[PDB]
């Protein structure tokens, strides 16, 4: 059920990691591969500790091995974008999130941060804030959810949501380790809780301003993957890992601007929702790496989910595409929540689509070029 | 016999937890679900360490997932009530016990603290003190008591009560960890001992004044559940886990007021016992989440238990519904013990019933409204 | 799958190693055996900590037991050459790399450092720099790659290159321990990454000047072997451990001189490549302990490999024998990479061949004597 | 999951059973113990093979060991009632079903055949026929249904009813062996099928005339118990072995007389149903060894069950207390089915109650004495 | 990997089944459930051995448990259609294939034999013959192909087609037992062979005239399911059990009439192929229980498969929709092969579609009514 490498003696590794480092510094480069969902990592040595991301040098990798290029010139380039403290090796080591460029210096197909940053720069004065709730499921190496009976199912749902106990919460050690690691690294993690389906968990990232939302979410995903690798289990972001009566995984997003946060911002909130109501198909396309095929299995209308083909909104409505918190309605200001995005969505795409539809008043089936 | 998540490497978790936290603080919210017996937990990040429970903000959760609401408006609200140090994450993190309210700000069905607080406030000048002895049994994940032979039984009772040795005490590590964690968290734990049935233990909480007794007992139960989850076993509060000659689990309660603690308080103790003798059915109803069905399996009159259908009292009588300690009788003052409450009772209900019957002189089959 | 000695309790060993050492110092002597691939080690006690390699004494060993001599006089002598901090015993203990000599003080057959040092001394003023990328595969004690299914294969290649996750990276603990140990010991390790074939990794050593490259690479190999022994697995440098579609292991080498590193050094780089193009067979002979038989299984022309029988070169060409980085071509200066050397090559031989062909303008089928 | 004795080598047992017997004959006496649910067996040697049940001698046993007597005179007596061929030892050995009498020759409290025989004799000229469908569940020695995931559940119901395949039918070998053994012994077994709940099966007995129905059903139950003992599993007749959404077990009974079977017997069927409609509580009391408490867990009104508190009848109605098959309604003659009896019912009690209510026109809350 | 019930002792079952039966006879009724893919079975006792299928009585079952009806009248009826010898219980026991009818005697939705029989009767004078090659895969109870490495893959395809040896053929015991059982029962089995993908096999049925083809194929499928259940494995007819480079499963069908079999029948074969070329979508719809979705995963145009979207035909072409054997072309008479049908097809649907298109000259998107 667990990987072979997880059965090695970890005391030896701790003893080795207790050695003083010296004066060299390790930096780990992270980037998104050609599938648009996976991550790749790489390590290099630095003479001294960098103080800002601008001080890190550029690097490169073979694109033909990551399904990002082919032919005689498959080399690609990594440009640092964000820097965080390394929780697996501690200070002064660093984690670096990088953008991918082709040999001719054009952004790669899956490099969606390049356009998102430019779009965000156009509405900086409005100070858009974001918050996302990432749900995921822990799986064993055999493809079965962690802690489930062999070739079987646990009891019916109901006792696992926010549950406590050896028979209600599965793999809380991973959750605690991930929370502490994210706090140490500097990620803006807001909370966690156990979900309805056993072995399914959730963590919230935010509030984040502008482009930092995607950086924080991607770094959190990478940290979760590394922690699960340490424990020997697999973390999956599939929107519907188990068919049937079991719950799916979503990536609900909170959105607000300076106008909405101010008293009587409910008018702007309703204006934004009205604008969003006319681009349901476009947003559904932008909320899935596969263009919407994956989210179809999740958004069926059953359980507390909204149908994929229909748009709806309301106040304190958990079955609607867009939900307005009751507190926001009472205090006529705040934010609104979008419940459509899938668990394996790309935050850059979601934020860019929201900004384009709500603030830039874009219309049609394609994005503007500016 | 043990949960799958208990077989993960705990050294890795310790290494992760050794990381310095920084400046953010974690707070865990705890509340009672719709069954009136289980507990639910949730974590969020705070900007700075709170100094008093009044500084914590409110929160909310989906009531339809905890069998506490249904329909279009299932949102519920959590209001902090008590704060304790977190023993699983250490300082400056906190544990928070919260009350549950409906979307219209009315207390939920299982929110019994709301009325208990007012009832206690009505008689604050008398300074009522409480003390409860919680008994529980450790179980494996297969439903069999921890340490018992597979599909079998241990030797007859007699050597296990307060026993020491590998063949007499089962799971003392859980007991020691729970004791130390409760002491660290600030819970008013008074002692522990092994019980007659193997794998059955007990801990005493008190003396506590007024409403604090329920808070302390609930927090102790939550800590026990978390510790057992860490070790991979299950702690059950069922009054009669194993049918037959094996002992049940009770929640004996001690009660006294300022008058009873002074000289010649035995007169007031006897008056209170006489008052209690006329509301046996009411108290039996109030001493069980199921209205008394569960306690029927325990209170059969055999062993050192009193019959459910008959009320009795005496001095140094272990088979009576109410017992007066011999020392109290000799010194004409002190307290008296109620042996009726079941292991899975709700402390708020028990304390409220005792206060209503003994101090407010209430009568009838229903509580007063005031 | 793991060695028996790896199942011993390592906590006991750590407890023993925690004892204070005192005033004596341990020194470990390392030398290359008669096969030209393996390493041998030996420990002795010293009165005080040596400050430089010149202070260490000479030693000896029985050559008949290492396939390095035979007959009546099989004794051999060890002469210290380089000193490093000991990462397995920490300071003040040391690691010592030694040369092997016969009973008559003539260098042994596998002692290639003797000639390499003189050759490097002949061209010291030009300041040649080197950099090598060592690839290796982790194997179980049963001869199967670590983490692979029993008598089976993992999924097709593509997700493992620079992968993260319990199902994409095998044995990262060994890699982390080796990296930290190399950093502590003073080896000039530059980076690491996961390779295309699962359970295959690599690390980069450099830049190193002159003879130090071989010392650093050999010490890194020894440290890797010791770490893998601690974890209970085997590290193999075979160029083609698994036949079929799975990738082989190489030892790509970077080379540059003072002239090449200055402005318009591309001219000298091209001249060196032109010189190299005429000694393909000689270099292939010098790049393999077996004379080229082992490298035949790797250099087949398929995948990202060049054919053994044909020489080629180009800019940003990963299928050529010699590759010129695109950045170097753009900035008309830098270094060039040789992709022919096998994983189990001897760094001294490779560096000596490169120096002889490029700087000394040697020709013919045999090396010059001077 | 299986018995320890089931792990003994069975080839040895077969070799021993291959020995020729000789002249002596083995007879196994079977009787119902004091719980009214279990069976007890006992073997003795006979000089020659008996041809009729009248040739067998009487026997006795200690009643204090079977909860059927106590005190100074606890000896009970066995009187043979029916004889069958022995399928476990083959011819000429026999199985004998016996009645239990007290030391003073009065029938035992659990001996219901004594009165049932007289009641049947009173109405012999009407030729009442009976048929019963016995449902049961196969369980492991650990208390979990055979073949279910450990501490878990299989998939939802729907594919297991009359299913075929390794993932749809559990323990078919027991069913096949029991069928063949019943056919060999002479029991009037009519068919079998897999039931809705996995590991749940069913077999039909009949048509049987008068008192032979109970004898045949009891012998079939004993044979099933012996076969399951041979295989190492447990057969349980509990009406609701698994709480929740899983189906219970019933003992539906068929009934008809000579008048009903003739042309236009539907009139008599309707008269009998009308009579039965006024003794629902009496029949519920008679259909359960515990007086109706066990059947309460099954007859909840959900699934294909009727409510215990209400009586209903109809044609081709599977949710009613009494069902008239559609073919019977079309042809105006045949039988009707009673779906109330529990799986662990006593056939003698059921048949006696049906005869008393339908043919003898008895009324009131107690049986007549005659 | 294998079922729990497969671990029960089988010598006990053989001993029980060695008992002489007697006069009564067992008959097993078989029918197709509401999914159109699965089978259900049921056993009853008969007084004497039936000689022809006309002597067997009708039966019934609850349709609400097989997804074939719902509501107040869910009772269905079984009408015997074909009879075979029982290989699991031997003579004189029988297997009975039955048709399903609703409570009003209308055929069920999945009862396709009713219309197929009439269609065959309309063209009886032309003597159509059929033959099918059923492919299947053996799976363990964990969902992985039988004999494959745990969480892994075997070597690449190429040595498994018609292979012999412990490392090339998996589960040949099931194949041998199924062959012998089919021969005993009277099924017209023509041969078997191991397929390209390891653990994949195939058997051929035919030549069969008219309606008997479907009966024979269904009985063979049932026998295979029972044998696999005996061995504890699962046989799956999924057209693409393993995604990727592994071969799918098909049900290639042969077809010919009296005119085609005569001299110069190639003209009629070509006419039939020309007719078939214009109803590709109709036949694709008729060749899959799901209307063509399952076959989409198989007919991708790669390997020895044709594209689902295109129709093609040729002589000795394995990549075409229709193949004319080279021997048939040389001899100018014989048959042609249709390679489109899926492995989980319904033979009645396939044969009916072929007859309607080729002999009745039907056109359009719907079948005629006659
Ligand atoms: Mg959530
Ligand atoms: Mg006690
Ligand atoms: Mg490489
Ligand atoms: Mg039934
Ligand atoms: Mg084939």
From Swiss-Prot, chains A, B, C, D, E:
Q: Per its record, what triggers expression of this gene product?
A: By glucocorticoids. Vitamin D and the Wnt signaling pathway inhibit its expression and activity. Glutamine synthase (GS) levels are regulated by a negative feedback mechanism where elevated glutamine levels stimulate GS ubiquitin-mediated proteasomal degradation.
Q: Which domain of life is it from?
A: Eukaryota
User: What EC designation does it have?
Assistant: 6.3.1.2, 2.3.1.225
Q: What is its main location?
A: cytoplasm
Q: Where does ATP bind?
A: 133, 202-207, 254-256, 318, 323
Instruction: Report activity regulation.
Output: Glutamine synthetase activity is inhibited by methionine sulfoximine (MSO).
According to the record, mutating residue 13 to A results in:
Increased ubiquitination and increased proteasomal degradation
Residue positions, PTM N-acetylthreonine: 1
Q: Which SMART domains match?
A: Gln-synt_C
Q: Phosphotyrosine modification sites?
A: 103
Reactions performed catalytically = L-glutamate + NH4(+) + ATP = L-glutamine + ADP + phosphate + H(+); L-cysteinyl-[protein] + hexadecanoyl-CoA = S-hexadecanoyl-L-cysteinyl-[protein] + CoA
Transmembrane portions of the chain: none
What clinical condition is it connected to?
Answer: Glutamine deficiency, congenital: An autosomal recessive disorder characterized by variable brain malformations, encephalopathy, severe developmental delay, seizures, and decreased glutamine levels in bodily fluids. Death in early infancy may occur.
- This chain's protein is named Glutamine synthetase
